[PDB]
Design a binder for this molecule. Structure first.
Ligand SMILES: *[C@H]1O[C@H](CO)[C@@H](O)[C@H](O)[C@@H]1O[C@H]1O[C@H](CO)[C@@H](O)[C@H](O)[C@@H]1O
Length: 36
């Protein structure tokens, strides 16, 4: 899973998108979504 404060869903982001249990994937910007 993605770490806390990590990107959880960018458009074209091939890395860890699934937030860790206890973190919310908050889309902050078009490509930047962060596990908060
Ligand atoms: C958490 O770790 C992931 C890799 O294991 C990264 O992909 C994430 O973006 C996230 O890293 C960022 O946030 C953490 C918060 O603890 C910082 O420690 C990292 O340096 C980085 O800024």
């Amino acid at each position: 899973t993605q770490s806390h404060y990590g990107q959880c869903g960018g458009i074209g982001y091939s890395g860890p998108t699934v937030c860790a249990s206890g973190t919310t994937c908050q889309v902050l910007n078009p490509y930047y979504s962060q596990c908060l």
